[PDB]
């Protein structure tokens, strides 16, 4: 096979066509920890986590494609401050190269900072399967679905209050379809066959689509509570926004 | 499947329609530790905790939707102080960008601070099952229920006393329904089938509903002991409040 872009769900096509704001919001994403505490069971290793530890770099991508935010790199801040120290110590001397002759400006800092966690991971919420065999020939199916949940909250950096906070969920579906034959065809001959197929939804990909959903819930809530303005009041009734505004009532169980 | 909001129990629909106060209370939630000490048994990994480590971000959401509290982010306080240092060091120089030109105000600090823990997790409190098979054809059920408990206590930050403290509980139900056929239909043919289904309640979701219950016990107790006032004395007899006031007598065993 050949590499390509990371595949996207319906939420990324939903996130990209958001209506335009008046201006973008500078935002810092420091750390999104794996607060699930869940590791993978047997036959996987005892050390492998169930959820990938890269939820920080997934949100910064999702904020960037949204055309609403300008993220500032604070995860590699310790490496970014070390590169500017190499410039600034050379700027005092005359030993600057042809690049970086001009004095650098200070770090751009943000007005908000969204942070959050992955709030729990639950494996095998539902399971089932139907198998049936007549004489020699039959088939069976199975399925298991897991569940993930992501918290995201927007913090005002001036005061320190939390402006809005949402929890989005996603179900990771895994199934398996198999069929087999073990039968005596005409005397002292044994016909035998087996065809199977499984499919696991990647939790790397369901985590990306649960974060992309949570950004649209953050952006649409800001238009409601007056945190930020759209470019036109007539596009309050946008058909992407009313899809995520009639989902604000949570499901019941 | 497609992502959506995190599903909610009856307690969140119970929490949202609380009667209105006169004013909101600033509150800081620092840390809610997993004080159960319990990890998942076999066949799960030896390192995976039974309760998720994200009870801090669950309470701050539950306080926010309650329309009674304005939470202040103290979990990401070390990242919030680092962003303001990037502003304040640039504010002395003339190297501020177009944003953050105005001087920032200090951190808003709270009058109370609710903290607590998850006080123990007990697996397999009750178990059972009924199975029965006649000639070739039968079925069986099973169930296991676990138990969780969450402590929450409100601390006055001025003196240091503990104003009120409640313990809420929740039972995590898991069951399994299965039926199977293994029978000789007409000579030298073997009919055979199997249909099963399990269901585990997510402990990620039962922890969220045990915290949402504990906030209503905290809010209703404050109206009783005169910690804070409702907007109207006539809404003391609200039908949501009297549901959680006639539950104040604990069950017996």
């Amino acid at each position: 096979a050949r590499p390509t872009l990371m595949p996207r769900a319906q939420s990324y096509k939903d996130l990209t066509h958001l209506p335009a704001p008046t201006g973008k919001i500078f935002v810092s994403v420091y750390n999104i920890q794996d607060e699930t505490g869940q590791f993978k069971p047997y036959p996987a290793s005892n050390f492998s986590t169930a959820v990938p530890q890269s939820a920080t770099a997934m949100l910064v991508t999702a904020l960037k494609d949204s055309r609403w935010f300008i993220p500032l790199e604070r995860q590699g801040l310790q490496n970014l401050l070390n590169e500017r120290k190499i410039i600034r110590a050379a700027q005092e001397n005359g030993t600057v190269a042809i690049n970086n002759r001009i004095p650098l400006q200070s770090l751009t800092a943000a007005n908000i900072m969204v942070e959050g966690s992955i709030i729990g991971y639950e494996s095998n919420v539902k399971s089932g399967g139907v198998g049936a065999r007549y004489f020699g020939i039959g088939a069976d199916t199975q399925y298991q679905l897991d569940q993930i949940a992501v918290n995201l909250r927007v913090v005002n950096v001036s005061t320190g209050e939390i402006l809005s906070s949402v929890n989005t969920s996603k179900t990771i579906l895994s199934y398996e379809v198999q069929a087999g034959v073990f039968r005596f065809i005409d005397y002292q001959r044994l016909l035998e066959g087996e065809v199977g197929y499984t499919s696991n939804e990647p939790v790397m990909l369901c985590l990306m689509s649960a974060i992309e959903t949570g950004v649209i819930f953050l952006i649409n809530d800001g238009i409601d509570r007056g945190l930020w303005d759209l470019q036109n009041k007539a596009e309050r009734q946008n058909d992407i926004l009313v899809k995520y505004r009639h989902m604000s009532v949570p499901p019941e169980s | 499947a497609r992502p959506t909001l995190m599903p909610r129990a009856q307690s969140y629909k119970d929490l949202t329609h609380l009667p209105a106060p006169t004013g909101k209370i600033f509150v800081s939630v620092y840390n809610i530790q997993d004080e159960t000490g319990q990890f998942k048994p076999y066949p799960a990994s030896n390192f995976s905790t039974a309760v998720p480590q994200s009870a801090t971000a669950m309470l701050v959401t539950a306080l926010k939707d309650s329309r009674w509290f304005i939470p202040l982010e103290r979990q990401g306080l070390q990242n919030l102080l680092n962003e303001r240092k990037i502003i304040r060091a640039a504010q002395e120089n003339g190297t501020v960008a177009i944003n953050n030109r105005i001087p920032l105000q200090s951190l808003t600090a709270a009058n109370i601070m609710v903290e607590g823990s998850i006080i123990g997790y007990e697996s397999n409190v009750k178990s059972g099952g009924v199975g029965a098979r006649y000639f070739g054809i039968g079925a069986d059920t099973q169930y296991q229920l676990d138990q969780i408990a969450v402590n929450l206590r409100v601390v006055n930050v001025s003196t240091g006393e503990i104003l009120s403290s409640v313990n809420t509980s929740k039972t995590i139900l898991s069951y399994e329904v299965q039926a199977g056929v293994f029978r000789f239909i007409d000579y030298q043919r073997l009919l055979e089938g199997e249909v099963g289904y399990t269901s585990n309640e997510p402990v990620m979701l039962c922890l969220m509903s045990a915290i949402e219950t504990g906030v209503i016990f905290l809010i209703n107790d404050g109206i009783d002991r005169g910690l804070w006032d409702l907007q109207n004395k006539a809404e003391r007899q609200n039908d949501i409040l009297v549901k959680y006031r006639h539950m104040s007598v604990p069950p017996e065993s």
Binding site: P21, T22, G23, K24, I25, F26, N111, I112, N156, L163, G226, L227, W228, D229 | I98, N99
Partner: peptide, 6 residues
């Protein structure tokens, strides 16, 4: 609000 610069 939060300030928008764009």
């Amino acid at each position: 609000v939060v300030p928008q610069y764009g």
